[PDB]
Structure formats: C-alpha cells, structure tokens
C-alpha cells in the first residue's frame, strides 16, 4: 500500500497570503500519478490538479502544482476567501489507490468585523452563501442520527 | 455537460444487503473508466472499487474484497455498487466517480454521493421485552432532543452569519 501523507493538517490564514500544501509519498512515483482534489464544505470533492502541475477546467490561475519523486506540492499564489475547503492529494499509480487525510484550510479571524469590513461587498456575499451548504449538511446528519435511534424502537414496537 | 446523479442510499443491519446505482448522462459513458468512493464520518476519502470501461477489469481494496460487488449497465447508462456483509466502518457518503485517462487514474467528475448508514440494532435485545407504552415513550422523547440538536446548529450558524451582515451594512 503507498501511504500518502499531508501537512499541515489544518491551517488558518488571511486573503491575500500564499499557501503552500505539501504531500509526501511513501514509495517513488511518477509525476503523471499524482492529483489534488478540493472539497467546499456541504458539496462533494471536485478534481483541482491533475498529473502534479495541471490544472483542471475552470480552476483559476492563482494554483499551482509541483514535485517528483516522493515530495510534491499545492501552492496558492494569493488566498481568496472563497478557497476556503479541504485539500487533498491522490496517488493513481497502483491498487490500491489511496487519499491523503486532508489538509482543511480556513479564514483566520474569519467572524471579526473588523477584519470583514475592509472585503468587498460582492466577497462578503459570496462567503455569507457558503454558509448554508455547511448548516445544511449539519443538519442532514442529525436526521441520519436520529433515524437510527428510532430503529431498534420501531421494531420492537412491530414485533408485539 | 457531465452529470452523475447516485441513488439508493439509506439505513442498513450490520450484516444486511444495499444496491446502490449512478445514472450517468453527457458523455459517453462506455469510453470510461468508472469508480465508487466514499467519505466517512472523520471525512477521510477510501477508494471502494473501479470497473474499465467495457467492464472487464474490476478492482477492489482488500477491506471490500468478497463484500462489494462493482457493475454497469451500458443499455442504461449506469452504475451499481451491490453492498453485502455490512460492517460499522462502512457508514459513509457514496460518491460515483469517472476517470478522464487510464493512464493516470485522475478522478474528473463526481457525483453529489447517496449516504449509507450501518446502523445497529443491539439496543432491541432488551426493548423487545418493554411494554408499547414505554416504546413509545421513548420514541417519543427523541423530537424534542433532535429539534433542540437542530435548533442549536442554526444559532451556531446565525451567529457565523452576524457579523458578516453587519460588515455589508457598513457599505
């Protein structure tokens, strides 16, 4: 099995700063094996990078992909808020195939006005929207949860 | 264009049965390589099987192995994932999945996923015994304890939406 491994884990930054997400292989690869995915928080994974450099349709310009060997990296030249997800890296070279953990990225003092009122109006829209995905999800969770607990009952309820 | 639409997600008994499918439409669908993976609880991502795209070759991570069962239908335009011998570290979220090329096993689309829960039934070994009043009972209980769960993730979120709001009143 190629264990892939990520750092950081979880990171918390500015719009404006340069981000850098490394994945770490434990056995040597071809360039042409290795992918990131991004995941926005409430929506599925969707393909980033492919083959260490590439970028995939409709990904802008602001990401990049390096590496061989065994290092390889996701850099994001200048944080937007909107790049607020889940990063992670993929080896396609063999079966199995296998996901690093993760790398979560999030706004550093994201709730503080003071930092808040200084974005732009279309900016703070676009991240207020983002929001009810998340709580959605959330609550679907709960429902899952709770549809479980009711089983058992229901059953033994039926079996009188 | 690519649309990848996954049903037949639900509740599950450890040991029971689940067949999911994925309708998939803009492409052609028997030019590619197709795969199931899924997101667990700690939302990790586990590759759980891959078919060619005639349908030949099937992979599988050993986890899976004599468990899972991968299949298409190229008449239909669909996927399937027939799920046997249920265990607790199989409650996830299902995702369909197409690989662009063979030749490097990225993933290019993904569907929304169909959630599977494996949820346990030990709890009726001793409330087989209760009386349908005190089921009841219980069953009962549990509304207010998921609405108050509910209701306190919306004042979460209510308060990550505030200051925001107020940032945009401020222009």
């Known amino acids: 099995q190629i264990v892939v491994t990520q750092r950081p884990t979880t990171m918390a930054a500015s719009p404006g700063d340069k981000i850098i997400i490394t994945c770490s292989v434990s056995?040597?690869?071809?360039?042409?094996?290795l992918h990131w995915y991004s995941q926005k928080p409430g929506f599925s994974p969707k393909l980033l990078i492919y083959?260490?450099?590439n970028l995939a349709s409709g990904v802008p310009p602001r990401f990049s992909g390096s590496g061989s060997g065994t290092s390889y990296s996701l850099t994001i030249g200048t944080m937007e808020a909107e790049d607020v997800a889940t990063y992670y890296c993929?080896?396609?070279?063999?079966?199995?195939?296998?996901f690093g953990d993760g790398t979560k990225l999030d706004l550093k003092r994201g709730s503080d006005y003071e930092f808040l009122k200084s974005w732009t109006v279309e900016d703070l829209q676009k991240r207020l929207l983002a929001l009810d995905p998340m709580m959605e999800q959330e609550i679907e969770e709960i429902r899952q949860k709770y549809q479980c607990k009711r089983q058992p009952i229901l059953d033994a309820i039926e079996a009188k | 264009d690519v649309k990848l639409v996954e049903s037949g997600g639900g509740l599950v008994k450890p040991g029971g049965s689940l067949k999911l499918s994925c309708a998939a439409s803009?492409?052609?669908?028997?030019?590619?390589?197709m795969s199931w993976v899924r997101q667990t609880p700690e939302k990790r991502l586990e590759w759980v099987a891959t078919?060619?795209?005639?349908?030949?070759?099937?992979y599988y991570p050993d986890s899976v192995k004599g468990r899972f069962t991968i299949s298409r239908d190229k008449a239909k335009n669909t996927l399937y994932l027939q799920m046997g011998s249920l265990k607790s570290e199989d409650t996830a979220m299902y995702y369909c999945?197409?690989?662009?090329?063979?030749?490097?096993?990225?993933?290019?689309?993904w569907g929304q996923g169909t959630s599977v829960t494996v949820c346990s039934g030990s709890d009726y070994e001793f409330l087989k015994s209760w009386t349908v009043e005190d089921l009841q009972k219980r069953l009962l209980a549990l509304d207010p304890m998921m609405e108050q769960e509910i209701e306190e993730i919306r004042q979460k979120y209510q308060s990550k939406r505030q200051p925001i709001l107020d940032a945009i009143e401020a222009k």
């Open positions: 993929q080896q396609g070279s063999d079966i199995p195939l296998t």
């Open positions: 078919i060619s795209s005639g349908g030949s070759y099937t």
């Open positions: 803009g492409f052609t669908f028997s030019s590619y390589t």
């Open positions: 083959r260490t450099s």
């Open positions: 999945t197409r690989i662009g090329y063979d030749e490097d096993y990225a993933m290019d689309h």
């Open positions: 056995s040597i690869i071809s360039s042409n094996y």
